[PDB]
Design a protein around this nucleic acid. Structure first.
Length: 135
RNA sequence: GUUUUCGGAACUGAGGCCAUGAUUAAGAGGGACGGCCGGGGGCAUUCGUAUUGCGCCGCUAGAGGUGAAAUUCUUGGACCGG
């Protein structure tokens, strides 16, 4: 676990994926390409209750935990990439989206580029739920 | 007996003549033509993510879903990243 660079020089960049759904959160971190992930921790592995897997708090300390994991490897600046549920479902990021990256903003990391990679379809398939919706 | 002058009837030929014969072109219609216009129609063709599945690769114990859960998937590696 040794990143070959001086601290007093430049910054090693990695990209993290915030998949903040409406029933869980993901703070997946990988390298600048994506074919090698460093640490992926979810909101569900931080509280033993289903109802708050997508709470902002369960995404606040899951952000601090992955932050400490990216310390001894040599990552100080990250790239944010938001993601809602995408597809035919919603495109608004979950309630755990706000406090996630704000936690790692106050957790020693640095921030690069922000992006929303919610996989917006061109022309959707049939969305789940009846014609009368969800009653 | 006979042809006609004779009235009537039919047909052919030359004409002369008519102020020689056809209303207008519907804020009715059809049609032609002109440059257009359009998620009109048919046939073909092309493209776009997404979804689902499969393969490989990464790291890992949870993932899903709910008002709250469970059924279901998961160290046989699920979910998540490529």
């Amino acid at each position: 676990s040794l990143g070959p660079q001086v601290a007093e020089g430049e910054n090693v960049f990695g990209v993290c994926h915030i998949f903040a759904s409406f029933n869980d959160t993901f703070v997946h971190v990988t390298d600048l390409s994506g074919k090698e992930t460093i640490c992926r921790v979810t909101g569900g592995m931080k509280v033993k209750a289903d109802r708050d897997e997508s709470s902002p708090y369960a995404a606040m300390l899951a952000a601090q935990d992955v932050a400490q994991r990216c310390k001894e490897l040599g990552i100080t600046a990250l790239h944010i990439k938001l993601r809602a549920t995408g597809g035919n479902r919603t495109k608004t990021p979950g309630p755990g989206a706000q406090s996630a990256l704000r936690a790692l903003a106050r957790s020693g990391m640095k921030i690069g580029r922000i992006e929303d990679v919610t996989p917006i379809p061109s022309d959707s398939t049939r969305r789940k739920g009846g014609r009368r919706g969800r009653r």
